[PDB]
Curated annotation (Swiss-Prot), chain A:
Motif annotated as LIR 10, chain positions: 387-391
Name of the protein in its database record: Cryptochrome-1
Family per record: Belongs to the DNA photolyase class-1 family.
Domain annotation Photolyase/cryptochrome alpha/beta: ranges: 3-125
Disulfide bonds: none
Encoding gene, per UniProt annotation: Cry1
Induction info: Oscillates diurnally, rhythmic expression in the early night is critical for clock function (at protein level). In SCN, exhibits circadian rhythm expression with highest levels during the light phase at CT10. No detectable expression after 8 hours in the dark. Circadian oscillations also observed in liver, skeletal muscle and cerebellum, but not in testis.
Stated consequence of mutating residue 460 to D/E: Strongly reduces FBXL3 binding. Reduces PER2 binding
């Protein structure tokens, strides 16, 4: 009896600009926010778990708690509907095809149980289906066309009001005394992860951290060092929904006017994100080659041993290996570093499928969703949307090689003259550095000049086809 | 003639035994001895005695025997030197401070008697002193720096040749027909133990068992069940020396190669061993809080009754009690189960000193040496190395049906999975049909976890504010 509401957290792990949760509370006697735990690496799971602990803490401020439940949503929700006597369920819209299919299945389960479902857009700046409509029923496959469509859209509506005590009103959350025992956020070890020797996260999760960084980021806006994680970086918080894209949009617009009509390059980060979400939303095989209508079909090498050396940073190229080590250790690498390793794996040196690189980035990268990961890997491998040197790229960006020394400590003894090509160092240099190439650090896995010359010919064959 | 003794302590094996190999060279006679030197529980003693009978049986294949002697080494060895007219003594090096002090005293006594002492490294992958020298004179206290040091060392030389007929050559072992009466391996009852109702060992000791399980482990390598002892587990055989760390290292590399550059993660089990041995070797108070230069001073509770409930698996938390029951009964628990009970006792629930948990583990755990035990307990209690699990939720997450609980806490077998991890929440009618009244046939929880852990988190946060 009564109006009992559940808001389902997946993305949008925040209380600000949360229109679905705002609407779910309206007219509700009770409210319960739930997160349901279904390649994913340990840095992704730690960021998520920290996101849920920050949500729980913020909900405690409102005399509520987060409910964490393990299971598959299709089995879990029929039980919750009855146990809690639910009449309304709310979600932030998910544009990605697998999320679409999951949410369509839950909507059917909810309707059959008599539960009304509130769906609101708030993970993207725009209604992706409306952009596709203005473009004639197909997503744009060029960024400039996307810019044209966006510039004709209506102005962005204001972000939804933050969930506070005034919004909650008389709505309450029923809680047992053993809430943590049944619904608490688990630790990594409670999920069976090996955390031995794990250091403190370079990217701590949560809306609180995201809003702290947003304020520091904007105050700052008002190279070798670029390779390292910035304390005001926002990319993972946008992927998990800790930071609203619309709030970030409006704060940037507000800053720009304080210091007219801003160029759309002002929103370059947000717009590239929307582009890939829009391209992917109606393409269930967007993350594949075969069966993907927009993906060029290319005969990639099948080489699991070469793939493993790339994935684990054992290529013998310190520039490539340091990037993949920072990626694995911390979960974020510079955009141009993503270019560098993606080129090395696919069209550049190894000629391995972009699907394999995408799968590694899905496990390790914090800030790249399914759509953005698939679209970027297709783009950089010349597979859709119409060769870096693994020595010179790093040497030009960081001549002293401090980046290599930070993430490949075994190379720390090498001078800047050989830090990016240690195989060229004389034996005496290697001995004083206590690192014999081919013993303490591997030899380069390919001759870059020979491999790149071959692959360049292969793709020219593809594109003359 | 040249009469030699090889002193077994660790390294209870004939393969990759450089000290024994060097001792045999140029010797006319050889005698292998183990000295039973007066907390160690019955499962540790049984594993040891099975290692010694495997050693004795493998020495019989070479027309030799193991000589087992009860006494203190500083008293026994002056007698043996004269009785057997010994001029050669060999040992595998012991990095741990108490073993270091003992061996220095025996080396002095041997020199006084005119006996040369042969010492060879073979219990650890590396020369721990060479690691510390490379680091500038102090051990690394982060595992990342230790990995950096290890990746700069020379490649490991191959393990020593197995003691065979060929290696023994002309050397021989004088034997009497009364050998078992004088020097035999004793039984547990013969050491005064109560073995009534003891079931057959889940972890049988010895080099033969170790090498069998190594072969199966390599083949297999080529969840709720994780909690149970694996038939291919190697951890206790590495602690006792039935299996060489260096042999394991080389079989792992060979399996990997059949790339030439495996990540260090491949050898993860071995390097964490080496890390704690290195940290402990020059620290004679490594197992203490006061007077230990690397350990944060924390005002732990003194509560012997709560410690006893934890040690004996009477906490009232079935996940905790099942783990401690498996540990007592078999001598091995999963690594994550060790985290669970360590957090419950120290930083999590009871606020009892990590020194007390280490002493219980020292008595019951088969696979954790002094250095690894002390280092792990300091680590998990946030007391060193620059460092809260739910006692209901963790088990429920790991084994939802509760089969682990039903296996080790049979009084709870009747409870459904819904309450098997928190049986105090079960309605009385469930408790009645399960024939286990909570507070009568199985104790109530000894603490309110939510209240205890919240207060102890605040205690620890104050500790690190004082430090900062
Ligand atoms: C309370 C307690 C006592 C002992 C052991 N324990 N027992 C054995 C070993 C270890 N420790 C570890 O592996 C280890 C590795 C990394 C880190 C960061 C820690 C904290 C422990 C390796 S050999 C057999 C454990 C796991 C917990
Ligand atoms: C291999 C790889 C995977 C993923 C990402 N990656 N990660 C994140 C984002 C993106 N892609 C882009 O920005 C982007 C924009 C324009 C073009 C033409 C391309 C090719 C990528 C935006 S949000 C966080 C990148 C940079 C490379």
């Amino acid at each position: 009896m009564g109006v009992n509401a559940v808001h389902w957290f997946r993305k949008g792990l925040r209380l600000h600009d949360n229109p679905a949760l705002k609407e779910c509370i309206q007219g509700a006697d009770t409210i319960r926010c739930v997160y349901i735990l279904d390649n994913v690496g340990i840095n992704r799971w730690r960021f998520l778990l920290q996101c849920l602990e920050d949500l729980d803490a913020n909900l405690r401020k409102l005399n509520s708690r987060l409910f964490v439940i393990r299971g598959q949503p299709a089995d879990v929700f029929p039980r919750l509907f009855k146990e809690w006597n639910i009449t309304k369920l709310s979600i932030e819209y998910d544009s990605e095809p697998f999320g679409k299919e999951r949410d369509a299945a839950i909507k059917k389960l909810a309707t059959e149980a008599g539960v009304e479902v509130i769906v609101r857009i708030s993970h993207t700046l725009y209604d992706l289906d409306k952009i596709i409509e203005l473009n004639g029923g197909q997503p744009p496959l060029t960024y400039k066309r996307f810019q044209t469509l966006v510039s004709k859209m209506e102005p962005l509506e204001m972000p939804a009001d933050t969930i506070t005590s005034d919004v909650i009103g008389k709505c309450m959350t029923p809680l047992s005394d053993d809430h943590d025992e049944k619904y608490g956020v688990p630790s990594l070890e409670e999920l069976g992860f090996d955390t031995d020797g794990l250091s403190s996260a370079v990217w701590p999760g949560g809306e609180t951290e995201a809003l702290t960084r947003l304020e520091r980021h904007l105050e700052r806006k008002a190279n070798a060092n670029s390779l390292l994680a910035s304390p005001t970086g926002l990319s993972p918080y946008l992927r998990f929904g800790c930071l609203s894209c619309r709030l970030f949009y409006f704060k940037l617009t507000d800053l720009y006017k304080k210091v007219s009509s801003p160029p759309l390059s002002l929103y370059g980060q947000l717009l590239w994100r929307e582009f890939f979400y829009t391209a992917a939303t109606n393409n269930p095989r967007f993350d594949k080659m075969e069966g993907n209508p927009i993906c060029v079909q290319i005969p990639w090498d099948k080489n699991p041993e070469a793939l493993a050396k790339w994935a684990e940073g054992r290529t013998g190229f310190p520039w490539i290996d340091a990037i993949m080590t920072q990626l694995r250790q911390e979960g974020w690498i510079h955009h141009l570093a993503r270019h560098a390793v993606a080129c090395f794996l696919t069209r550049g040196d190894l000629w391995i499928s972009w699907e394999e690189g995408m799968k590694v980035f899905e496990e390790l990268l914090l800030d790249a969703d399914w759509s953005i990961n698939a679209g970027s890997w297709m783009w950089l491998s010349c597979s859709s949307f119409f060769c870096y040197c693994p020595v010179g790229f790093g040497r030009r960006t960081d001549p002293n090689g401090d980046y290599i020394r930070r993430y490949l400590p075994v190379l720390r003894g090498f001078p800047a003259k050989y830090i990016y090509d240690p195989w060229n160092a004389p034996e005496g240099i290697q001995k004083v550095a206590k690192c014999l190439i081919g013993v303490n650090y591997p030899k380069p896995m390919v001759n870059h000049a020979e491999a790149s010359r071959l692959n360049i010919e292969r793709m020219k064959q593809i594109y003359q086809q």
